[PDB]
Design a protein around this ligand. Structure first.
Ligand code: HEM
Ligand SMILES: *[C@@H]1O[C@H](CO)[C@@H](O[C@@H]2O[C@H](CO)[C@@H](O[C@@H]3O[C@H](CO)[C@@H](O)[C@H](O)[C@@H]3O)[C@H](O)[C@H]2NC(C)=O)[C@H](O)[C@H]1NC(C)=O
Ligand SMILES: *[C@@H]1O[C@H](CO)[C@@H](O)[C@H](O)[C@H]1NC(C)=O
Ligand SMILES: *[C@@H]1O[C@H](CO)[C@@H](O)[C@H](O)[C@H]1NC(C)=O
Ligand SMILES: *[C@@H]1O[C@H](CO)[C@@H](O)[C@H](O)[C@H]1NC(C)=O
Ligand SMILES: *[C@@H]1O[C@H](CO)[C@@H](O)[C@H](O)[C@H]1NC(C)=O
Ligand SMILES: [Cu+2]
Ligand SMILES: [Cu+2]
Ligand SMILES: [Cu+2]
Ligand SMILES: [Cu+2]
Ligand SMILES: [Cu+2]
Ligand SMILES: [Cu+2]
Lengths: 1034, 466, 104
């Protein structure tokens, strides 16, 4: 099919919450909508003049195609099949130049629609600039490289938007979805064997980043002289927590039937705070044929869903994000009787599992011992990291908190306890682990004894309309929504095969339950509990898995006691002067914020013991807000998740994953969250492996015995050696134009920093450094590409030429001990790096996978001082026994380098600053002036070396490290990639977080240089972007 | 030093030099690549260099299940409690199971056919993809495991994944043993050598060393003399399958794509059953497909299998022909006329004396395969002795031998005694007409063929726990 | 080794209870005759130029193959009493018994 849609950009008045009456929302307190929607002489209101994509019938733009009303402000539904030459006729009636730039569809430079430096003539720059009163024809093509992968379904999620200054057009509204699908999956533009198709876009669309924002204020605000644009509360009222624009559940037309085979294309967009967790209330969904409930959406993240409509009623599609959930990021939908016409299962009353939990209040000390175990430093050490949290004084509470939490009882009387054995010793702040098989019927007798009404919200089981924990609506006695301080309610959940794990998922899956009256506040009180829904014929009578040795439940999260209802109590009870307690102070809020793992901080969680030969099945889950971006790391051990082998697991509010592991190294290891402000913030722990199997001389398997020479050397690091890529970009955007990171001004540092990196030397002399060849020139700040093949023995003969102690160590690589010894100024040491099968790729991993080799002297500060490098652990017959191989290998580290958190800040303040006597490290403007947003350590199209040929196989190893604000959405222009063994999955916008390491296989064909960037507003504007050169044959 | 691209004789390489007037390799500066086997004790000035067995010596179907714990786990289906071995996640052979692929970095598969993009298979042993006929046997046994685990789930519902897998593993392992000892070994050794070296089993002897002798790694390579120069594919009526009924063997090595894209494993098993093997004759030892073009598609130069065998015995420091003769209580010819008498072939004795100068120096494989075959057997007296001795030790020194008491019950042993390879093919493929027992003798269609319906299937009754 | 076990271990360990590694994987082969090396303990025959074995020059493996193994394929004799499956069980069986590792 030659498809010809006629896109048109207009400038219309858009209603964010189109009423019309009358809603009560989850945790929303009525008189709170007006924070974002009410119009006065200071607030802009609910209506906003915005740029919008519209579909038209004719080359003559006079009559529009009506858009689905659930689609909101998004551009018209564009679909493309494998080999379809889809044309796009864009017209711009708007007052400013825009564009059409599309994801995951092949285009020539004459039809990209994304402006940025790219040594190209005018003819190939006409698409890049479409002014008012202009028309352009965008010739697109869905190729074999671009179409859905093997493991994908028939259709996959894609997008399109205007691309002069990426985010500022999107925030102005210009964002439309594309639905890329296989060659013959569609009939009448409708996917074969699909009842309904709905597009869902979660985006806290920030109107402060919109062009028209300026012309939005002249009209609706009664006083355009009393308003500052640098005003946080004015900036808060304009951030629109919106799924398709319609905020506070104002989203309409979402009408679906019973047994309706419904497809969901959900994608996230915005900025750093756009940390999304979508969930369908009492609905079962499937991704890549895996059972899920909570999706995680982030800027430009492309994701699809298949759900069989079940359990009729009027439900909720809410944002997990507890801050987003208290900002009306919700949407109602109806499943109706029409009536079926099939049932399936079936089994309401069968296997009856009965639990008798009860809520109660206690003194919960986070670090019971009173000592940070990692160093033996105590919690009240002067000035220290842990001091700020664990100080008890005038206005600081200390280590103890009053917290309502779940605890299980044996029977209906609630008089005597079911006691916690050695297994339940690790749970702590977590309540009882509730577990079920497929076919069972779970009944929970909840006896609340706390002075606030509560409930229980299970995630992973089906529950009827009158057994739901939370309340929400389009329109005494003890119920399900409300369980008063004195009351008792009996829940009744159903768990069939329509909500249970399918063939593709492992035996048990990680799930969770939490009180659902005000989950933005109830959870932070500690009313969270682990769940474990499992298949038919699996668990023993006691509850565990057959032939699985240990079962662990870790719930790493930032417990915000400020959000706790027991805030007023904890103030009165532990602080010396309760009168002086300032709730609206930013130093006080960070104290009650307690970065923990199961309610334990700094390594105090026990009960995490296992032997050398156990079948360890970790069940993880998380909660919280846009700060909860986790990277839970297991040192010296590798787990298997869905045939993907990692050591670092990623969590976001309401994520729940089941990791499988088997210990091989004896020792006291670490459960440290890689997130650099959580780690020093209190999210690091200890798990132990004993010896319960005779030693027995092993090491009979050494198919390789390599030796490498690394050195932590110091040189001046230039983040932008030439700022010439910066000017052309801004110029081509008409932009102006200040740079907070690079410009020097009066006292700031600029681009040049004295940093410490690894480098490759010839030998033991450390006199002749290895020369970095053209193919390996893309490394930048990163060290030499270490290659290890399953069965190798990698020798690192490290030297520390730096002036202070550093250390070399890898991710997931097997070592001898549980400790990495630091090396000193002048010293030489040898670090044995063993490469077993478990340190290699999994059956669903691409044979060449990356690991991050780092430093253990100060993994927070050394990281930001410049210690990072890629380890490439491949399979076996890859090496060619030589070197040069026709499989281009690129490694890219996506990290916001916090120059503040270096060992050489005070040396950067003295050497390069014009006026050092005017630098206060505690200024946010200067702290921002030193967070250089750089891939591989190079900003604003500075990263060279990226060059490949037409008809090449180009490997991309993407490494994620850093902080809470280090969520990075890696996007390639002009071409997509393919993940999963054999390249079964395909995507052009990937999710890279502090801890994730992934190979991406790209098959390029179009010649020319292409924009390579993260897709986060701030980060893009922070120069986190480069290019790659695909050249045509000789 | 890279042994694959360099002809320099430095560790861990030992390249085979090229003689003048070589029928193929014209450049005497060239060589056939060769990696010395891994030493048991690297860099020792004390130990005498010995080599490592990466597998369990026992006949326990380790080629199916693996011999190391990481692999053995990864070969199982951990997505349920059915006790299954993982199957391919992209392809099926007419709705029947294949092997889980392994990622294409640059494994030998993506080399046999570039555009097909079929990687090597993953099995209990790293060599399952070497020839498609071998692949077909791996696939066959993997199907039989999953079939046995299924039937055992219905017969014993209380059983979990572990119990099902172990019980199905215990069966497959016993089936490999029965076929090997009952059908295969008498046809290798002949009646006389069978009676001598493999007497009737009595019970398990804990004083019998079950380890594979270094020499067996070379001596059992007699099978290289049985290789036909083609892979033979036959259709459902056992007629040549078009358009490639006879694929030269140098185009099938590591050709995993032929299993996946060229009709599955049925035309292969049929071709194995209804085509004769090559006979080992004294002037017709081994075909040029393995002598001249071994692994031609997956490396820089065609290898010479017989020459590698000889280079390997030296690498392993194996004594010569006469030393093994003396070990076996066999007379040692010292002159050319004596070697002529022992080989019952003077012309070949001469060729050997021209090469080696004395019979003492003849490499074990060459001397072994040169000896005239025993009646109703396919090795000579020296190989018979080495091969025979090895399998007696593997039988008598296995605690889990299917006939050893307590391994199986009496009724289980009785039920197992009814298995056969033909029946396994009947139970796990789209093939409905198979060879008459003995499968290793029959090979003429339709003379030596019966229908699957005539063969009783295995009775799992005595496996009911009740 | 446990007192009781109905199933084999994967490694083969504990099959012999008196010597539990016998037959197990990743162990040195047994030697039925003492090893014959050019230096008597490691170096293979044909490693050092001019160094004879048992008083005679070591023949190149490739030359023995050319003069003794090589035959024209049109002279090939099909076994009238063995099938190609006889060849294939042999290889399958060998792979149940031994694999001799080399450096990658
Ligand atoms: C598709 C046909 C076959 C091919 C391509 C093949 C190829 C090979 C190769 C390349 C080696 C290693 C050579 C070296 O570098 O020293 C080898 C060794 C071996 N093969 Fe063959 N083989 C096949 C058939 C057979 C048969 C039919 C038998 C026995 C009935 C056999 C017995 C073995 C044994 C016992 C070894 C030594 C294995 C070890 O311990 O590592 N082969 N073969
Ligand atoms: C079970 O297996 C073991 C091993 O085959 C049998 O032991 C073997 O028995 C023979 C004869 O009794 C031993 O040979 C002897 O050598 C000595 C020392 O040179 C010599 O003095 C005698 O002339 C005799 O030839 C052989 O060493 C021995 N092997 C081992 C490993 O101990 C055993 O008898 C078998 N038992 C049963 C019940 O079948
Ligand atoms: C583009 O061409 C210009 C010269 O016209 C040159 O500055 C530059 O090398 C080219 N761009 C890149 C980064 O390859
Ligand atoms: C930590 O040190 C303080 C003094 O700085 C001391 O009072 C306290 O005992 C120490 N902490 C503990 C609980 O050991
Ligand atoms: C496991 O078994 C199920 C049911 O037979 C099958 O569909 C699935 O493909 C298997 N999984 C693997 C990884 O082989
Ligand atoms: C390789 O496989 C393809 C199928 O992908 C087939 O059509 C082609 O004949 C094969 N190539 C050769 C050289 O046999
Ligand atoms: Cu985009
Ligand atoms: Cu964290
Ligand atoms: Cu980024
Ligand atoms: Cu793009
Ligand atoms: Cu872009
Ligand atoms: Cu920033």
């Amino acid at each position: 099919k030659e498809k010809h849609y006629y896109i048109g950009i207009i400038e219309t008045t858009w209603d964010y919450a189109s009423d019309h009456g009358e809603k009560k929302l989850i945790s929303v307190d009525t008189e709170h909508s007006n924070i974002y929607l009410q119009n006065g002489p200071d607030r802009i209101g609910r209506l906003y003049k915005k740029a919008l994509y519209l579909q038209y019938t004719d080359e003559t733009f006079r009559t529009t195609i009506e858009k689905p009303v659930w689609l909101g402000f998004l551009g018209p539904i564009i679909k493309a099949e494998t080999g379809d030459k889809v044309y796009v006729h864009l017209k711009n009636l708007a007052s400013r130049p825009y564009t059409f730039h599309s994801h995951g569809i092949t285009y020539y430079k004459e039809h990209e629609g994304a402006i940025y430096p790219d040594n190209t003539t005018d003819f190939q720059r006409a698409d890049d600039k479409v002014y008012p009163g202009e028309q352009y024809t965008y010739m697109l093509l869905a190729t074999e490289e671009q179409s859905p992968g093997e493991g994908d379904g028939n259709c996959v999620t894609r997008i399109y938007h205007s691309h002069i200054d990426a985010p500022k057009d999107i925030a102005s509204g210009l964002i439309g979805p594309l639905i890329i699908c296989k060659k013959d999956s569609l009939d009448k533009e409708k996917e074969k064997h699909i009842d309904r198709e709905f597009v869902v876009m979660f985006s806290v669309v920030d109107e402060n980043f919109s062009w028209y924002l300026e012309d939005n204020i002249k009209t609706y605000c009664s006083e355009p002289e009393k308003v500052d644009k640098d005003n946080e509360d004015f900036q808060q009222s304009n951030r629109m927590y919106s799924v398709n624009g319609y905020t506070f559940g104002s989203l309409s037309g979402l009408s679906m039937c019973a047994e309706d085979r419904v497809k969901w294309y959900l994608f996230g967009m915005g900025n750093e705070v756009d940390v999304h967790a979508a969930f369908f209330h009492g609905q079962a969904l499937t991704n890549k044929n895996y059972r899920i409930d909570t999706i995680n959406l982030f800027p430009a993240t492309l994701f699809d869903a298949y759900m069989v409509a079940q359990n009729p009623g009027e439900w909720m599609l809410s944002c997990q994000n507890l801050n987003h959930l208290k900002a009306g990021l919700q949407a109602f939908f109806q499943v109706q009787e029409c009536n079926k016409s099939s049932s399936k299962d079936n089994i309401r009353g069968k296997h009856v599992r009965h639990y008798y939990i009860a809520a109660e209040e206690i003194i919960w000390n986070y670090a019971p011992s009173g000592i940070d175990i990692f160093t033996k430093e105590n919690l009240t050490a002067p000035g220290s990291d842990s001091a700020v949290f664990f100080e008890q004084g005038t206005t600081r509470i200390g280590g103890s908190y009053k917290k309502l939490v779940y605890r299980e009882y044996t029977d209906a009387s609630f008089t005597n306890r079911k006691e916690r054995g050695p297994e339940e010793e690790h749970l702590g702040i977590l309540g009882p682990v509730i577990w079920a098989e497929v076919g069972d019927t779970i009944r929970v007798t909840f006896h609340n004894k706390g002075a606030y009404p509560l409930s229980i919200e299970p995630i992973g089981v089906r529950f009827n309309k009158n057994n739901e924990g939370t309340y929400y609506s389009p329109n005494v006695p003890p119920s399900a929504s409300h369980v008063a301080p004195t009351e008792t309610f009996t829940y009744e959940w159903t768990v069939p095969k329509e909500v249970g794990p399918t063939n593709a998922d492992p035996v048990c899956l990680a799930k969770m339950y939490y009180s659902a009256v005000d989950p933005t506040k109830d959870i932070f009180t500690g009313l969270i509990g682990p769940m474990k829904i499992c298949k038919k014929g699996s668990l023993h009578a006691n509850g565990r898995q057959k032939d699985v040795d240990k079962e662990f439940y870790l719930f790493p999260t930032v417990f915000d006691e400020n959000e706790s209802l027991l805030l007023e109590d904890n103030i009165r009870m532990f602080t010396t002067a309760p009168d002086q307690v300032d709730k609206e102070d930013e130093d006080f809020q960070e104290s009650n914020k307690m970065h923990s793992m199961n309610g334990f901080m700094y390594g105090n969680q026990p009960g995490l013991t296992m032997c050398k030969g156990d079948s360890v099945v970790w069940y993880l889950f998380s909660a919280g807000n846009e700060a909860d971006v986790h990277g839970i790391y297991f040192s010296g051990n590798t787990y298997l998740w869905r045939g993907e082998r990692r050591d670092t697991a990623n969590l976001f509010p309401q994520t729940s994953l089941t990791l499988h592991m088997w210990p091989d190294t004896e020792g006291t290891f670490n459960v440290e969250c890689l997130t650099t402000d959580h780690y020093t913030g209190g999210m690091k722990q200890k798990y132990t492996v004993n010896q319960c199997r005779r030693q027995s001389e092993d090491s009979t398997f050494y198919l390789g015995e390599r030796t490498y020479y690394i050195a932590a050397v110091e040189v001046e690091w230039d983040y932008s050696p030439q700022r010439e890529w910066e000017k052309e970009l801004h110029h081509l955007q008409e932009q102006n134009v200040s740079n907070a990171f690079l410009d020097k001004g009066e006292f700031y540092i600029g681009s040049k920093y004295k940093k410490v990196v690894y480098r490759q030397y010839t030998d033991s002399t450390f006199r002749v450094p290895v020369e970095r060849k053209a193919e390996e020139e893309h490394l930048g700040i990163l060290g030499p590409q270490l290659h290890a093949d399953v069965g190798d023995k990698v020798k690192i003969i490290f030297k520390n030429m730096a002036t202070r102690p550093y250390s070399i160590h890898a991710h997931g690589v097997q070592t001898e001990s549980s400790t990495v010894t630091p090396t000193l100024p002048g010293e030489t040491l040898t670090y044995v790096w063993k490469i077993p099968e478990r340190s290699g790729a999994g059956t669903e991993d691409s044979a060449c996978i990356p690991w991050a080799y780092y430093s253990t002297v100060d993994q927070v500060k050394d990281l930001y001082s410049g210690l990072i490098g890629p380890l490439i652990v491949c399979r076996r017959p890859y090496l060619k026994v030589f070197n040069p191989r026709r499989k281009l290998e690129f490694a890219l580290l996506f990290l916001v380098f916090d120059e503040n958190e270096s060992w050489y800040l005070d040396d950067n303040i003295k050497t390069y600053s014009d006026h050092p006597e005017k630098v206060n490290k505690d200024d946010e403007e200067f702290i921002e002036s030193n967070k250089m947003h750089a891939i591989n350590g190079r900003m604003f199209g500075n990263l060279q070396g990226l060059t490949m040929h037409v008809g090449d196989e180009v490997n991309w190893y993407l490494m994620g490290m850093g902080n809470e604000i280090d969520l990075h959405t890696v996007h390639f222009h002009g071409h997509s990639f393919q993940y999963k063994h054999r390249g079964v999955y395909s995507s052009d916008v990937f999710d890279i977080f502090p801890g994730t390491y992934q190979t991406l296989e790209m098959f390029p064909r179009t010649p020319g240089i292409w924009l390579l960037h993260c897709h986060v507003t701030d980060h893009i504007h922070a120069g986190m972007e480069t290019t790659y050169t695909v050249l045509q044959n000789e | 030093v890279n042994c694959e691209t360099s002809c320099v004789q430095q560790p861990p390489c030992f390249p085979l030099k090229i003689p003048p007037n070589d029928p193929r390799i014209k450049n005497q500066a060239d060589c056939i690549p060769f990696f010395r086997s891994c030493p048991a004790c690297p860099g020792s000035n004390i130990t005498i260099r010995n080599q490592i067995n990466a597998l369990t010596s026992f006949v326990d179907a380790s080629m199916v299940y693996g011999s190391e714990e990481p692999l053995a786990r990864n070969l199982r289906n951990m997505s349920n409690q059915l006790g299954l071995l993982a199957v391919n996640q992209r392809f099926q052979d007419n709705g029947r199971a294949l092997l889980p692929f392994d990622n294409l970095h640059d494994d030998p598969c993506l080399l046999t056919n570039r555009s097909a993009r079929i990687p090597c298979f993953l099995a209990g042993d790293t060599r399952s993809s070497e020839m498609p006929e071998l692949t077909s046997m791996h696939t066959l046994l993997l199907r039989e495991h999953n079939r046995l685990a299924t039937e055992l789930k219905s017969l014993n519902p209380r059983w979990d994944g572990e119990r099902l897998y172990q019980e199905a593993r215990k069966i497959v392992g016993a089936m490999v043993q029965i076929i090997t000892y009952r059908d295969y070994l008498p046809l290798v050794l002949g009646p006389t050598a069978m009676r001598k070296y493999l007497p009737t089993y009595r019970s398990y002897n804990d004083s019998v060393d079950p380890r594979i002798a270094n020499v067996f790694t070379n001596a059992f390579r007699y099978g290289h003399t049985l290789i036909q120069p083609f892979m033979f594919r036959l259709d459902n009526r056992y007629q040549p399958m078009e358009p490639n009924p006879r694929v030269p063997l140098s185009r099938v090595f590591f050709a995993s794509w032929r299993v996946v894209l060229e009709g599955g494993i049925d035309p292969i098993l049929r071709g194995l059953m209804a085509t004769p093997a090559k006979l080992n004759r004294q002037n017709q030892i081994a075909v040029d497909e393995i002598r001249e073009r071994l692994f031609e598609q997956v490396m820089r130069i065609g290898l010479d299998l017989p020459a590698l065998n000889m280079q390997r015995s030296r690498d392993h420091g194996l004594p010569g022909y006469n030393a093994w003769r003396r070990f076996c209580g066999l007379p040692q010819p010292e002159t050319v006329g004596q070697l002529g008498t022992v080989l019952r072939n003077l012309k070949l004795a001469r060729k050997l004396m021209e090469q080696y100068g004395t019979p003492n120096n003849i490499d074990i494989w060459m001397g072994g395969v040169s000896e005239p075959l025993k009646r109703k057997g396919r090795v000579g007296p020296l190989l018979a002795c080495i091969i025979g001795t090895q399998f007696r030790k593997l039988r008598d020194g296995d605690r889990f031998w299917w006939e050893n008491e307590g391994v199986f019950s009496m009724q289980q042993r009785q039920a197992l005694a009814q298995i056969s390879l033909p029946r396994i093919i009947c139970d796990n493929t789209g093939i409905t007409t198979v060879s008459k027992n003995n499968i290793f003798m029959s090979n003429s269609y339709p003379r030596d063929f019966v229908n699957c319906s005539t063969l009783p299937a295995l009775n799992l009754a005595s496996w009911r726990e009740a | 080794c446990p007192e009781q076990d109905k199933y084999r271990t994967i490694t083969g360990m504990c099959n012999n209870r008196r010597s539990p590694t016998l037959g197990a994987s990743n162990r040195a082969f047994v030697r039925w005759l003492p090893a014959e090396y050019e230096d008597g303990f490691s170096l293979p025959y044909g490693w050092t130029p001019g160094v004879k074995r048992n008083g005679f020059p070591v023949a190149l493996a490739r030359a023995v193959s050319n003069e003794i193994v090589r035959f024209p394929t049109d002279q090939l004799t099909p076994d009238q009493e063995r099938s190609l499956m006889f060849m294939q069980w042999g290889q399958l069986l060998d792979h149940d018994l031994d694999f001799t590792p080399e450096p990658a």
